[PDB]
């Protein structure tokens, strides 16, 4: 969900830029484990 | 009328270097004990630095065609160009091969060349090829020739790498001409007669005393003098001397009366030398000049000189014989004779004199192969373990 | 011929380009980075006073190296001969292995492409494909990697997928918009994928058995492949290759790690359009292979049983396919394809099973809209 938040910000950036499809605009599930770790750390720390 | 290289003949692989625009003659060598990697020992500097041909000598075990070698792998002949030859390091007994490992000395493709115990596999064998068109493949290889070796396993050449400051022998696609020089042929070697490169004890007098350095006083500095001593020392490595001829080619030839050579103490690794002060002192390899370290064997005290005799290519004539012959050591430049000071665990000091005592005659005793190998191992081990101790001290 | 050519090439090392000399060479990876830099630098790229008048030096160097590694990979001996154990063949393969290191190939495959984009107006801007780094360049690298080193280690397979394959697949998926699909870059990248990458992954299917640890990785691969499969600009052969590769991989993947791809499959199958053909085959194969995991309470002893959310999703999948078949007019091929799928999923679903009235929440379909599929 917070990846969706980030992707909404980056999508607004995409329309403002007029182009430049970002490689990580794919869904959070589609993202790699390494990229998902940036949000996983916050998930783990807040819940724990 | 021209000698041909065949199996069981001791050979050395010489190469040429153009460092800072000079012609330097180097030989492919390797100290089998310890580091298996091969290096190059300078032989053109025999005037100033003695060459350690003991680790440079190589023997040709077999010379078979590539077809026969492939068939055998699937399962005194003369070297003909186009065969694959099996080199065995004489001192160590391992075989030259491409180690298939690399030091990455500015060449990724290059493979290091070292020694291997097992002759099985395609790494040990080296196909032989002519350097130029003067001898096509299949022709008999003469003793004086330039040869290029191609690794069976890696299909590279025995190559001299100039990339680093230190010259390296590596398997590379670039080809370097190698020359095979015959050290000796044991097939025609006469038994009981002294030949170059043999490790021997210089027994002296009727008391059977031997020219030995001081004992294990824990000091390499104290182990630099020489003195006659008899007793249980005669069955120790402390009295083994290696007679190294001043010539690289045909070094294993029979010693003739009046041949200049250097005596090397096997255990300590130092060469016998004469000071200007008429006292013998063992100096290192770097400070072992021909004038300082050259000695000759004479039959009698008579001062007649044979002048200059040509050095004969081949086995030569057997003159000095073990036990039966009586020899006199004469320093080449000073003309002095080795003698005993007689000032006295006998510990009779050995000195140099321009007349000497009457009983300066010596006898020569061969050393067994096992004893010689053990003495060389002792030397190469004490060197490394002294470096290790000094490094720990620092 | 290959033995003669390799021997001549190593006899004359000057034919390998400056990088692969071995004489103070920077290596293939550094050379292609330098070629990239040449490609962006206009001063050193062009003549600097058409194709004949203007030759891109960076692309020329790239193509030269690609051709060299391609030729060496083709010269590499065959696997049947190397299994037979011919000494000459193993020698040649070892020489090629010495010639090219593995890390250089990994780095070249890891190097990415520039992405053509739409401009402010909306028209696509396309970099000159004849200039710069192109998928055919990596095709040769993959050919060499397959024929010389060979992919026989799961660790190396997943590392390569980390570094150079999954990013390419994701870029191809992201370039599936109607405007960006028609770009020649997309065609070239689809060609590269469907001709080199997917066949390699298909031939390396058994290694995918041990993928428990990289579940996120395997799920990302599955999702990217499925998105490419729904991509439209593909040719018939490209679609066939994608279908074969995906079926082969999912065949030996462990059942619980289908679940993420199944979640995406269940809401896209009820359309029963032409794009729905291969999801049906994938579902049929999965359920036929893993019915024990579903039917029996124990399931596979090593694997276990379902998490019951997969069971609910499978039930709604079955019902959706059933109703869609009921509504759709009879097509012979479509109905002969859906029947085995429907029967297999019905059999896999335990008859004694009871549906839970508790619905699922956070329906991803809202985020997964029609446009851009997300």
UniProtKB/Swiss-Prot annotation, chain A:
Entry PTM: Channel activity is modulated by phosphorylation. Phosphorylation is increased in failing heart, leading to calcium leaks and increased cytoplasmic Ca(2+) levels.
Tissue localization of expression: Detected in heart muscle (at protein level). Heart muscle, brain (cerebellum and hippocampus) and placenta.
Cellular localisation: Sarcoplasmic reticulum membrane
Induction remark: By TGFB1.
Described function: Cytosolic calcium-activated calcium channel that mediates the release of Ca(2+) from the sarcoplasmic reticulum into the cytosol and thereby plays a key role in triggering cardiac muscle contraction. Aberrant channel activation can lead to cardiac arrhythmia. In cardiac myocytes, calcium release is triggered by increased Ca(2+) cytosolic levels due to activation of the L-type calcium channel CACNA1C. The calcium channel activity is modulated by formation of heterotetramers with RYR3. Required for cellular calcium ion homeostasis. Required for embryonic heart development.
Illness: Ventricular tachycardia, catecholaminergic polymorphic, 1, with or without atrial dysfunction and/or dilated cardiomyopathy: An arrhythmogenic disorder characterized by stress-induced, bidirectional ventricular tachycardia that may degenerate into cardiac arrest and cause sudden death. Patients present with recurrent syncope, seizures, or sudden death after physical activity or emotional stress. CPVT1 inheritance is autosomal dominant.
Entry text on domains: The calcium release channel activity resides in the C-terminal region while the remaining part of the protein resides in the cytoplasm.
Family statement drawn from the similarity comment of this UniProt entry: Belongs to the ryanodine receptor (TC 1.A.3.1) family. RYR2 subfamily.
Subunit structure: Homotetramer. Can also form heterotetramers with RYR1 and RYR3. Interacts with FKBP1A and FKBP1B; these interactions may stabilize the channel in its closed state and prevent Ca(2+) leaks. Interacts with CALM and S100A1; these interactions regulate channel activity. Identified in a complex composed of RYR2, FKBP1B, PKA catalytic subunit, PRKAR2A, AKAP6, and the protein phosphatases PP2A and PP1. Interacts directly with FKBP1B, PKA, PP1 and PP2A. Interacts with SELENON. In cardiac muscles, identified in a complex, composed of FSD2, CMYA5 and RYR2.
Protein name according to UniProt: Ryanodine receptor 2
Native species: Homo sapiens (Human)
Gene this chain is encoded by: RYR2
Shown stretch of the complete protein: 2847 to 2894 of 4967
């Amino acid at each position: 969900n917070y990846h969706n938040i980030w992707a909404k910000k980056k999508k607004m950036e995409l329309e403002s830029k007029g182009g430049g499809n970002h490689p990580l605009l794919v869904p959070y599930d589609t993202l790699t484990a390494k990229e998902k770790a940036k949000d996983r750390e916050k998930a783990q720390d807040i819940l724990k | 009328e021209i000698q041909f290289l065949r199996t069981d003949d001791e050979v050395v692989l010489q190469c040429t270097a153009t460092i800072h625009k000079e012609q330097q003659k180097l030989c492919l060598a390797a100290e089998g004990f310890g580091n298996r990697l091969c290096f190059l020992e300078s032989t053109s500097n025999s005037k100033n630095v003695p060459p350690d041909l003991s680790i440079c000598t190589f023997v040709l075990e077999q010379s078979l065609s590539v077809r026969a070698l492939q068939e055998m792998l699937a399962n005194h002949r003369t070297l003909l160009y186009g065969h694959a030859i099996l080199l065995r390091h004489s001192y160590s007994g391992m075989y030259l091969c491409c180690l298939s490992t690399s030091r990455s000395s500015t060449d990724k493709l290059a493979f290091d060349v070292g020694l291997q115990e097992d002759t099985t596999g395609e790494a040990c064998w080296w196909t032989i090829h002519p350097a130029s068109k003067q001898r096509s493949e299949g022709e008999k290889v003469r003793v004086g020739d330039d040869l290029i070796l191609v690794s069976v396993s890696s299909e590279r050449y025995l190559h001299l790498s100039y990339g680093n400051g230190s010259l390296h022998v590596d398997a590379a696609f670039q080809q370097t001409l190698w020359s095979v020089a015959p050290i000796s042929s044991g097939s025609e070697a006469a038994q009981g007669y002294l030949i170059g490169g043999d490790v021997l004890r210089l027994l002296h007098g009727h008391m059977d005393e031997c020219l030995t350095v001081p004992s294990g006083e824990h000091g390499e500095e104290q182990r630099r003098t020489v003195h006659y001593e008899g007793g249980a020392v005669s069955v120790h490595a402390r009295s083994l001397w290696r007679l190294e001829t001043l010539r690289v080619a045909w070094s294993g030839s029979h010693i003739r009366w009046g041949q200049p050579f250097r005596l090397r103490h096997v255990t300590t690794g130092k060469y016998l030398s004469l000071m200007e002060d008429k006292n013998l002192l063992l100096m290192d390899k770097e400070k072992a000049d021909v004038k300082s370290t050259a000695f000759t064997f004479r039959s009698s005290k008579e001062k007649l000189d044979v002048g200059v005799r040509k050095e004969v290519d081949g086995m030569g004539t057997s003159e000095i014989k073990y036990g039966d012959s009586v020899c006199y050591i004469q320093h080449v430049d000073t003309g002095l004779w080795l003698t005993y000071q007689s000032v006295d665990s006998i510990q009779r000091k050995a000195i140099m004199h321009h007349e000497g005592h009457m009983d300066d005659g010596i006898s020569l005793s061969r050393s067994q192969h096992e004893e010689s190998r053990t003495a060389r191992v002792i030397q190469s081990t004490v060197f490394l373990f002294n470096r290790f101790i000094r490094g720990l001290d620092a | 011929n290959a033995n003669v050519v390799v021997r001549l090439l190593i006899r004359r090392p000057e034919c390998f380009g400056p990088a692969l000399r071995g004489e103070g060479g920077n290596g293939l990876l550094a050379a292609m980075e330098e070629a990239i830099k040449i490609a962006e630098d206009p001063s050193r790229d062009g003549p600097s006073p058409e194709e004949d008048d203007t030759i891109h030096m960076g692309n020329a160097i790239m193509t030269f190296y690609s051709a060299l590694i391609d030729l060496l990979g083709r010269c590499a001996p065959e696997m049947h001969l190397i299994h037979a154990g011919k000494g000459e063949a193993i020698r040649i393969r070892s020489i090629l292995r010495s010639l090219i290191p593995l890390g250089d190939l990994v780095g070249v495959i890891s190097i990415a492409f520039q992405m053509p984009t739409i401009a402010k107006d909306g028209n696509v801007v396309e970099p000159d494909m004849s200039a710069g780094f192109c998928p055919d360049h990596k095709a040769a690298m993959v050919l060499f990697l397959d024929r010389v080193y060979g992919i026989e280690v799961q660790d190396f397979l997943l590392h390569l997928l980390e570094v150079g394959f999954l990013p390419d697949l994701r870029a191809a998926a992201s370039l599936d918009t109607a405007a960006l699909s028609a770009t020649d870059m997309a065609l070239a990248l689809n060609r590269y994928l469907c001709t080199a990458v997917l066949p390699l992954l298909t031939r390396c299917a058994p290694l995918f058995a041990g993928t428990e640890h990289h579940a996120s990785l395997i799920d990302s691969l599955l999702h990217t492949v499925y998105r490419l499969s729904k991509g439209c600009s593909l040719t018939k052969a490209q679609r066939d290759s994608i279908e074969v590769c995906l079926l082969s991989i999912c065949g030996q993947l462990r059942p619980s790690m289908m679940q993420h791809l199944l979640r995406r499959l269940v809401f896209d199958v009820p359309l029963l359009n032409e794009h729905a053909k291969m999801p049906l085959k994938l579902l049929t194969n999965h359920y036929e292979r893993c019915w024990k995991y579903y039917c029996l309470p124990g399931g596979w002893g090593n694997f276990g049983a379902a998490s019951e959310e997969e069971l609910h999703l499978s039930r709604k999948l079955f019902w959706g396919i059933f109703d869609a078949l009921s509504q759709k007019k009879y097509e012979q091929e479509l109905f002969k394809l859906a029947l085995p799928c429907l029967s297999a999923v019905a059999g896999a679903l335990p008859p004694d099973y009871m549906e839970s009235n508790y619905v699922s929440m956070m329906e991803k379909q809202s985020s997964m809209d029609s446009e851009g599929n997300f």
